[PDB]
Design a binder for this molecule. Structure first.
Ligand SMILES: CCCCCCCC/C=C\CCCCCCCC(=O)SCCNC(=O)CCNC(=O)[C@H](O)C(C)(C)COP(=O)(O)OP(=O)(O)OC[C@H]1O[C@@H](n2cnc3c(N)ncnc32)[C@H](O)[C@@H]1OP(=O)(O)O
Ligand SMILES: [Fe+3]
Ligand SMILES: [Fe+3]
Length: 321
């Protein structure tokens, strides 16, 4: 019990789907067209990529990287799971980086996630993997949420995020933030700083980039809940897919993370394909993050022995941490 600070992300196994047949999905047509156009505009930006100035590509990667941290170190580990404490400067960089990533504000992000952990693979899970790959990748954003999500998730404590002034600052002014950070500024910066043509900055440095931060994130719900190993808990659906960790800068050890949702590393190994933990460990070094809550090797090993599927004994002691 390394974090009794909060407890609204611990898996509740007593909950199961027991409300009769699931109501039919309700399509939301505003989202469908935008998500279509986006992945078109992202796809069109791909054929444009060879005709881009070098700085435009690097800027895109940096922007992909910064938005990544705004979700992995920011929304996921700091605010949804409370796995460490951050000082004002880092939290300001994170709250901006989050706004470039455009995955709703932080209060609405963590609520959907805190429900995803507690009520995983149920109708109260906002991206119920058991509905299918498409649903949990992008489809959950195109149809209405099961009443279980609203009902059960509404009973989760969000007092901590309610009582943080910076998370609520984002919430109040989120609409102008995302327009500036996700679409306007990463288009005008390449357009001015090194003269990338507007058609390229819009479709490479914005639509493709956002489409790649978007899809890289959705792979943690779709792929990580189907393909991979289960060294730590064979009884859940979260997996250790290494590719996911690569694109999602560390959040690919979903089987560990769903078992140990309080570990600040989201993984057994601190720096292994986990650029996010590395970043978090640098802020630690600079005195802007402390109380990095990692799980003891005895608790992990005993948990592998209990509910593990036994694939771990091909990674047993390959890094110190
Ligand atoms: C490279 C980085 C890698 C990162 C790796 C991360 C791994 C982390 C671990 C695992 C993965 C986590 C990643 C998932 C996050 C991805 C998020 C995005 O990508 S968003 C893209 C842009 N934004 C949209 O596209 C919005 C589209 N969504 C919508 O339009 C609606 O939300 C929609 C259609 C999905 C649902 O429609 P409805 O009307 O049925 O539900 P509604 O409108 O959202 O909520 C209304 C009321 O329902 C309650 N309610 C909803 N959700 C609740 C909850 N979770 N708990 C309690 N009550 C809830 C609340 O009362 C809420 O009202 P009140 O928000 O307070 O004003
Ligand atoms: Fe998950
Ligand atoms: Fe999580």
């Amino acid at each position: 019990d390394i974090r009794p600070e909060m407890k609204e992300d611990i898996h509740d196994p007593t909950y199961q789907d027991e409300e009769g047949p699931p109501p039919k999905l309700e399509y939301v047509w505003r989202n469908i067209i935008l998500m279509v156009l986006l992945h078109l505009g992202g796809l069109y930006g791909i054929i444009l990529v060879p005709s881009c100035k070098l700085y435009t590509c690097l800027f895109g990667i940096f922007y992909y990287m910064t938005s990544a941290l705004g979700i992995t170190a920011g929304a996921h580990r700091l605010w949804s799971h409370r796995t460490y404490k951050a000082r004002l400067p880092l939290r300001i960089f994170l709250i901006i980086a989050n706004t470039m990533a455009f995955q709703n504000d932080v209060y609405e992000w963590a609520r959907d996630h805190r429900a995803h952990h507690k009520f995983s693979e149920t109708h109260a899970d906002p991206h119920n993997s058991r509905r299918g790959f498409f649903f949990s990748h992008v489809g959950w954003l195109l149809v209405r949420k099961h009443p279980a999500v609203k009902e059960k998730g509404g009973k989760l404590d969000m007092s901590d995020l309610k009582a943080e002034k910076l998370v609520m600052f984002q919430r109040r002014y989120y609409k102008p933030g995302l327009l500036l950070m996700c679409f306007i500024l990463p288009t005008l910066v390449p357009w001015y700083c090194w003269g990338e043509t507007f058609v390229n900055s819009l479709f490479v440095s914005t639509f493709l980039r956002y489409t790649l931060v978007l899809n890289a994130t959705w792979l943690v719900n779709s792929a990580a809940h189907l393909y991979g190993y289960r060294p730590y808990d064979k009884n859940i659906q979260s997996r250790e897919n290494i590719l996911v960790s690569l694109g999602a800068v560390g959040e690919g050890f979903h089987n560990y993370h769903h078992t140990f949702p309080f570990d600040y590393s989201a993984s057994e190994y601190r720096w292994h394909i986990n650029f996010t933990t590395f970043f978090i460990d640098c802020m630690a070094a600079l005195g802007l993050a402390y109380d990095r809550k990692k799980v003891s090797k005895a608790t992990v090993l005993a948990r592998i022995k209990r509910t593990g599927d036994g694939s771990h004994k091909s990674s047993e002691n390959l890094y110190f941490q």
